[PDB]
């Protein structure tokens, strides 16, 4: 906090036991530069100077120009406390005295019971359907008409790969993941090329996420270099992708519309072929499952959220109806964003 | 594993292997019950 | 400066006689603030959103409003010091020992020679140059045609009227002043 008296002769491992001076300042300060420059360097793609070719490769390289900056600026401060990355000193078990690589199915110090061995299925039911919904849905946001990617996608494939990945890896004492939403939406957004406004093809191939994957595994050997990397800087990042990730978002967009007056409207089909408080009625109803759903986040009961998340297809399917015309639930869900 | 550990009869391949199986032999079992409908 | 101990026994009037923590980096946050809120309230004003004569009202009082924001954000911030404005007291002389409201054409103190009542000219010369330019070319500035002013200018009332009341604040001990371009 901002004190006017601090405690200078403070402990500092592993972590700050009390306040610090000018370290809550500066991450503010380190997250908005971090962010101020990625916005800026992305307008500076979309922008009219410098030799375009150049300009378009400063632009692509425009969050790892902005972290090389902000992490600098860190760098040239050294009276001040930052919080740094921290990676784990080897590649060893997290706790060496509970568990090893190999877990035993029968137990480790105790025998795991036959009932459990039955049992799991039900909290092994709760993860299928989380996983599936969240690496499907990812799939299919990335994967849309709209992004224009030709290569294709495998809705079969990757979920079999994820889930069987995830269930090796419980075997050997680690997590099972998931197809995230934001990270992929920023990965597919990295690898998309403009045109002369309007997306002209995406970079689809197996050797970014590859290597990304590569050198997540030999970050821990990259402690020298990820030790004078600041969270504010990341934070920064993360506020960027979060804002980034609503382009291609119609709900957002019509959110937008919301507070935009109906002649500023553009000239879409769920504007023109709609009336505008129809629309907005639309935009009413996904805003009120968008409250339901962050109201289930906040309670302890918030793995029911893929449940209350899958009945917003029977709303679509049949309440939407009851209400909406056949025109109006075209031009307003549409797949490939079609005029009916 | 790591420190002391109860001692099973089956090692973790010869538990993993006897559980593959099972699995494999269940799936099998569910394929060809579908095979057996939808046919008949 | 950013440093890792302070003292926290600082003097305070009249102004701090020593560095204090989260002064320099609170007000680069609150200037940048006010810059942000400012040009984010420019946009806004031209932009499409709102019904547009809010968004022309609300626009108008832009920096007002990025003033007052950063302010009640610096008055709830109360532990940390920031620099204010500092106003006179009252309405008397900066230095009531050396000179009163109307000061002597011929000396307060000592007798004003009669060499330098000639010799005021050139100095005269120069304040009148540099008055005169500045002054003008404002005028020049704010008077284009493409600024769409259709009552006029004036450049002969105006550099009348600012050199005649410089020189008549003169004899009152004031600063003479000149029509500021920003
Ligand atoms: C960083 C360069 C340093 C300056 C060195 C000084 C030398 C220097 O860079 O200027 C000459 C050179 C002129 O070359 P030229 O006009 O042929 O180059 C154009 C330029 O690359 C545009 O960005 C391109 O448009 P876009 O964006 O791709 O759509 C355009 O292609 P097109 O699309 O129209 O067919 C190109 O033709 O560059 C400039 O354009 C002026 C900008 C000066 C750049 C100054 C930036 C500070
Ligand atoms: C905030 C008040 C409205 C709330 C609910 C909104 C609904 C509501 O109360 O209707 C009033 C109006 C609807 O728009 P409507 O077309 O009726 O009115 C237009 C709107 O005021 C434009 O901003 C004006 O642009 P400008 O003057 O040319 O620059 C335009 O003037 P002109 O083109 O005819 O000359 C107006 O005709 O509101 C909005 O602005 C929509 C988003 C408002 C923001 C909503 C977020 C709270
Ligand atoms: C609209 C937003 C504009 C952003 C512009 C930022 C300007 C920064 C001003 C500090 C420069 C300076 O000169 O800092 C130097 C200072 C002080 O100088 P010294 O020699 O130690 O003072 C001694 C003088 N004595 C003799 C009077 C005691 O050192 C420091 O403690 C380092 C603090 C630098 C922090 C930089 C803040 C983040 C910058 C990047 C933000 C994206």
Avoid at chain 1, 100 to 126: C, K, N, Q
Avoid at chain 1, 249 to 273: A, M, S
Wanted: hydrophobic share 50%; charged share 15%.
């Amino acid at each position: 906090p901002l004190q006017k008296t601090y405690n200078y002769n403070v402990l500092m491992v592993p972590k700050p036991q009390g306040p610090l001076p000018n370290t809550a300042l500066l991450s503010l300060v380190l997250m908005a530069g971090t962010f101020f420059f990625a916005m800026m360097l992305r307008k500076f793609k979309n922008s009219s100077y410098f030799p375009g070719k150049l300009r378009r490769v400063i632009g692509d390289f425009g969050v790892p120009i902005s972290i090389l900056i902000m992490v600098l600026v860190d760098f040239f401060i050294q009276d001040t406390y930052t919080q740094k990355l921290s990676v784990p000193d080897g590649f060893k078990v997290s706790n060496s005295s509970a568990r090893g690589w190999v877990i035993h199915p029968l137990g480790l110090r105790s025998e795991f019971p036959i009932w459990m061995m039955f049992a799991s299925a039900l909290p092994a039911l709760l993860v299928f359907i989380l996983i599936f919904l969240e690496s499907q849905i990812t799939t299919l946001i990335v994967s849309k008409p709209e992004r224009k990617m030709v290569k294709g996608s495998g809705f079969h494939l990757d979920l079999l790969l994820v889930v069987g990945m995830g269930g090796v890896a419980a075997l050997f004492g680690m997590p099972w993941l998931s197809a995230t939403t934001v990270r992929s939406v920023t990965h597919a957004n990295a690898l998309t090329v403009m045109g002369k406004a309007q997306i002209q093809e995406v970079k689809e191939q197996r050797i970014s996420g590859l290597l990304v994957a590569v050198l997540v595994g030999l970050s821990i050997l990259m402690e020298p270099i990820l030790s004078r990397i600041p969270l504010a800087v990341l934070f920064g990042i993360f506020l960027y992708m979060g804002v980034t990730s609503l382009s291609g978002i119609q709900l957002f967009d019509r959110i937008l519309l919301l507070f935009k007056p109906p002649k500023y409207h553009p000239d879409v089909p769920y504007v023109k072929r709609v009336k505008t408080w129809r629309m907005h009625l639309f935009t009413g109803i996904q805003i009120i499952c968008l409250a339901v759903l962050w109201v289930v986040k906040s309670t302890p009961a918030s793995l029911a959220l893929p449940f209350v998340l899958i009945l917003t297809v029977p709303l679509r399917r049949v309440l939407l109806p009851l209400i909406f015309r056949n025109v109006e639930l075209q031009c307003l869900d549409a797949d490939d964003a079609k005029a009916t | 594993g790591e420190r002391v550990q109860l001692a099973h009869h089956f090692s973790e391949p010869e538990i993993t292997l006897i559980i593959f199986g099972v699995m494999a032999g269940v799936i099998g079992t569910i394929l060809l019950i579908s095979y057996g409908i939808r046919r008949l």
